């Protein structure tokens, strides 16, 4: 049960959403950036914690943050 937060420094380049291997993130209409869109994390129950989204974020410091927490059979990535 990891937690993913998006901060208002996002520019809406959509790289984090493309990088997510489990479809946790998605783009949402917004006002506050030139692209006029921001990222959201509705399916945080499916997050595995790989932190590819953080690696894909261009910003001084990250606009998307992953805070590791309770481990579950989906978070542990178990096929058995």
């Amino acid at each position: 049960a990891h937690s993913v937060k998006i901060y208002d420094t996002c520019i809406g380049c959509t790289q984090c959403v493309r990088a997510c291997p489990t479809d946790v993130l998605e783009m949402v209409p917004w006002d506050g950036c030139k692209a006029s869109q921001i990222a959201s994390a509705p399916r945080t129950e499916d997050c595995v914690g790989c932190k590819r989204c953080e690696s894909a974020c261009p910003t001084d410091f990250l606009s998307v943050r992953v805070y590791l927490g309770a481990e579950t059979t989906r978070s542990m990535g178990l096929a058995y």
Partner: protein, 62 residues
Amino acid sequence: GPKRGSIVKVLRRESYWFNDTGKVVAVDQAPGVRYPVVVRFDKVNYAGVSTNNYSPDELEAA
């Protein structure tokens, strides 16, 4: 915000270029943009980029 071609100092505390000088590239004049100033630097950060967006109150006139 600062005019194009200005030299500004970053004051964002979590920024990689804190207390370092920049080079203003473009300022967005839309009313609702939260970080409209675009600043380009000389050295790349850990992620390898050299451009960032800052608020007008996170830059110094020098």
